[PDB]
Amino acid sequence: VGPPFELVRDYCPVVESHTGRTLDLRIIPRIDRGFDHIDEEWVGYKRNYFTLVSTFETANCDLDTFLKSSFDLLVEDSSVESRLRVQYFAIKIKAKNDDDDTEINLVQHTAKGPQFCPSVCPLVPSPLPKHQIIREASNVRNITKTKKYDSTFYLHRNHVNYEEYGVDSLLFSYPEDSIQKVARYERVQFASSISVNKHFSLHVILGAVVDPDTFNPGIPYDELALKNGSKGMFVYLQEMKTPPLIIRG
Secondary structure, eight states: OOOOOOOEEOOOOEEEEOOOOOOOOEEEEEEEEEEEEEEEEEEEEOOOOOEEEEEETTTTOHHHHHHOOOOEEEEEEEEEEEEEEEEEEEEEEEEEETTTTEEEEEOOOOOOOBBBOOOEEEEEOOOOOOHHHHHHTTSSOOOOTTTTTHHEEEEGGGGSSSSSSOTTOOOGGSSSSSSEEEEEEEEEEEEEOOOOOOEEEEEEEEEEEEEEOOOOOOOEEEEEETTTEEEEEEEEEEEEEEOEEEEEE
């Protein structure tokens, strides 16, 4: 189903703040629409949308554990081993011009009115729904208000007994109550380039959002807007990509 992904790099190690154990992190991507497999190669078309869905899993940790515990980012520059408290995990989407080896812009639509840059999606570990389910959901509005899909795509913090958690539980750090279990980017396309068959590449990045008002370290990270409207950090953790995609007219 769609172009395959491969691991690019594992960046910053994440450790359960209490035990010091590394958290096993695994990005589970999948393009559910947009490319054709033409003789040992994947083909896309500039004037065609594509769907990229993804989730991540924690090999050595179940959901409940993930929500009750705390996690730190091991920041070991040269000598001192500091620690950045993770506020929440999230996935970001990106494209790349494989010929130039530089980054390309991605854009999304809805019908085709307003155009916007894809967003950073907060997530919670989870199995990636099969291609069918994804497609179905692509036609279900207000998934949250649906017994059928809700549980599969979201987690409602406001539905859990707060008494069974701790003041520093990861759960209370997430942006909002409605937390996605699967990032869903549909009607996505490569941004209109300046008047140039190119070779593009799609990437999925897993990051830890840290709020600097709790301690900058020199490590791979993107500037992010915190709900509290201030400078936040999206620190890479893992990254996967697709083989060079052939896009034509």
